[PDB]
Amino acid sequence: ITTEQLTTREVGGSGVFDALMQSASNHLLAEFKNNRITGGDYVKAYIATMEACMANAVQFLTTKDQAYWNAVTAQVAAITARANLGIIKANFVTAKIQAL
Amino acid sequence: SCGAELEANALLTALVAGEDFTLPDIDMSGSEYDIPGGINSPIYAEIEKITTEQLTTREVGGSGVFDALMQSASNHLLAEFKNNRITGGDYVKAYIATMEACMANAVQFLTTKDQAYWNAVTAQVAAITARANLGIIKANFVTAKIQAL
């Protein structure tokens, strides 16, 4: 993970922070073309969410990969547990024999 | 030969006569002692890495989680808009005020979306395994009684 992935110096880049800015701007511009918000009103709302997007970008980027690998570990354990289930059935017969 | 096995059977029956040693009869080949959801289950489905595209798309109304909340919130407001109870200026103002709330919840939901599912899967597998171990406990119960003798 590098600072380039978090945000690019250019606006509208591949950075996570950049993606939130463009996504937020597009939603505001959708109503801008609907003739319900003025240009001055649009930019004011866009600026007010600058710190919110930056704060969430750091939180999302850090935990983006952690969730994926936790799911992978659970999947592998489930397969391993299924394999161990066959051993349990074999041991069940062994316990019956040992009683005799 | 010479009826060696016949003598052993007679001695074993007489020596251990007078006590019950019926082993439990449990069929482990049934579907109860097997995990449901075979090769076609979502468990075996490939896990896809989480990317920023899934969180939100640059286009409005896309498949992103953040996009879904925006469209869902807008539709509810537009429902009353067609009911002639809110003006257009009032509608857009309420829509904007929830922008940060939707974004904050989108990150929280997306991160924990898969964690809850796999925790449930692990519990289900453990329950099946515990049921299989239950039969072993019954067998060991008879063993404990024999060991006392």
Side-chain angles (χ1 to χ4, degrees), chain B residues 133-149:
Chain B
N133 292 329
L134 183 60
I136 301 181
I137 301 301
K138 299 181 180 181
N140 294 16
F141 173 78
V142 184
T143 303
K145 300 173 59 181
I146 301 180
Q147 185 176 172
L149 262 56

Side-chain angles (χ1 to χ4, degrees), chain B residues 36-105:
Chain B
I39 188 56
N40 300 317
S41 172
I43 302 179
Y44 291 87
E46 172 183 337
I47 303 181
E48 52 184 4
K49 292 186 176 181
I50 301 302
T51 61
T52 175
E53 190 72 19
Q54 303 179 9
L55 171 62
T56 172
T57 314
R58 311 301 173 88
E59 276 290 339
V60 55
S63 61
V65 181
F66 170 78
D67 308 327
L69 298 180
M70 279 297 192
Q71 187 174 4
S72 180
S74 179
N75 292 327
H76 293 65
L77 290 178
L78 285 180
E80 303 295 334
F81 184 72
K82 287 299 181 179
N83 293 331
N84 190 19
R85 282 190 285 265
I86 48 178
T87 60
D90 192 10
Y91 149 78
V92 58
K93 180 177 303 302
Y95 174 79
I96 297 180
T98 60
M99 172 168 296
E100 57 277 0
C102 295
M103 183 177 60
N105 295 274

